[PDB]
């Protein structure tokens, strides 16, 4: 579950912290909020490697472009470069990204699908929990949201996904990008799914496991003398 | 549901605002009317990715044309669209209506179906919802209509297309192309549904 919400003086994006391999939870606390540029962040759904890889590549090319032009990077640049890359690979790079940020032009919120289609919105949701999240956004969104209202709405839309979607789970990650301010990255903004104490300690008595052989491993280099 | 209609003072482009991934509405306020030049616009139907990719290249080609040879004709714009659509017909799902205002040629509409063929028409309709309004549009279209008449014709036409087609819906967007300039119109459900 990844959401983006526009507010009065900027944009906020949120995500859950679950990665899955089939029905198994591979990572209980995983970072889906990617820095393309200091004030351009995007949330990723789809193939986990593809979302990281495509944001790092464009993030790198955006940094070189920023140095070349002597200008802070723009969201439309990251957006154009992402969509042209994803379109080239005809959806075979399974990256579904919500791209947000502030630049000299103002605050921007875009979604980009794996086939290279882009759209504009005041509120967007992507991933398996998009329908749970969109339900909350469609119910509670209004024009002229404050920062505090936009964070609340964003994290509420992720929670909807966490609870009602088997694909989404664990914690809520938020990033706030306000005009004329440093983007604040709130890692584990909420922790609604903390595991309860176990009934028993499974710490074994020493010498429980049967050992065939023992040896020192040499990790050091070839020695002197 | 997309259409372009020629009238006395120029041309009007109309579209719905619904983007679907299966039976889910991904975007209910989509802008399916895209600028390729100041007074040359297009309506996009088929793959969202393919039509954007094409529209982005055409806008590039006409910007470079303008730098060298000045304002391109609507016919020229249609030809660049056709060239991309015809030569890449095996890898593209794009149905594009091209509409533009010259002072010499006035209002012109070109439709480009899947094949990549070009057809110059007084008015054109396309998209999934177009099938339901072939009868209506044919009976109700006249040449050299007024602006108000042409806005009504498009509003009523797309109103029916939206009503019957599940893939069509949301707001009706229109773009008026005349000597006066470029006007953007929006019509909300509460207005067009009760027609």
């Amino acid at each position: 579950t990844i959401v983006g919400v526009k507010f009065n003086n900027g944009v906020v994006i949120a995500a859950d912290t679950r990665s899955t391999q089939g029905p198994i939870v591979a990572d209980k606390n995983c970072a889906k909020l990617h820095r393309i540029s200091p004030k351009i962040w995007c949330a990723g759904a789809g193939t986990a490697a593809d979302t990281e890889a495509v944001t790092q590549l464009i993030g790198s090319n955006i940094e070189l472009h920023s140095l070349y032009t002597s200008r802070e990077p723009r969201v439309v640049s990251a957006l154009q470069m992402l969509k042209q890359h994803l379109f080239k690979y005809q959806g075979h790079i399974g990256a579904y990204l919500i791209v947000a940020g502030v630049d000299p032009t103002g605050s921007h919120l875009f979604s980009i699908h794996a086939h290279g289609s882009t759209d504009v919105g005041y509120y967007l949701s992507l991933g398996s929990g998009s329908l749970a999240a969109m339900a909350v956004l469609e119910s509670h969104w209004k024009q002229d949201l404050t920062k505090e209202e936009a964070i609340k709405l964003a994290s509420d839309a992720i929670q909807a996904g966490i609870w009602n979607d088997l694909g989404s789970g664990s914690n809520v990650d938020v990033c706030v990008m306000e005009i004329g301010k440093d983007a604040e990255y709130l890692r584990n903004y909420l922790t609604p799914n903390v595991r309860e104490e176990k009934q028993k300690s499974y710490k074994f008595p020493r010498g429980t496991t049967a050992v065939l052989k023992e040896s020192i491993v040499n990790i050091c280099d070839i020695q002197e003398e | 549901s997309i259409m372009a209609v020629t009238f006395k003072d120029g041309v009007i482009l109309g579209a719905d605002s619904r983007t679907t991934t299966g039976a889910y509405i991904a975007n209910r306020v989509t802008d399916k009317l895209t600028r390729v030049h100041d007074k040359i616009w297009c309506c996009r139907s088929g793959s969202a990715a393919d039509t954007q990719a094409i529209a982005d290249i055409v806008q590039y080609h006409l910007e470079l044309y303008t730098s060298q040879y000045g304002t391109p004709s609507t016919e020229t714009a249609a030809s660049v669209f056709k060239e991309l659509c015809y030569e890449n017909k095996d890898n593209l799902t794009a149905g594009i209506i091209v509409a533009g205002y010259d002072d010499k040629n006035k209002g012109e509409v070109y439709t480009i179906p899947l094949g990549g063929s070009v057809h110059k028409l007084p008015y054109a309709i396309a998209g999934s919802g177009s099938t339901f309004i072939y009868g209506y549009c044919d009976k109700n279209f006249r040449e050299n209509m007024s602006k108000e008449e042409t806005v009504d014709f498009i509003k009523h036409s797309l109103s029916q297309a939206i009503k019957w087609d599940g893939s069509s819906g949301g707001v009706i967007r229109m773009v008026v192309l005349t000597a006066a300039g470029v006007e953007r119109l929006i019509f909300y459900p509460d207005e067009y549904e009760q027609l």
Binding site: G91 | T20, S47, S128
Partner: peptide, 4 residues
Amino acid sequence: XAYX
């Protein structure tokens, strides 16, 4: 996927 997205596709009037």
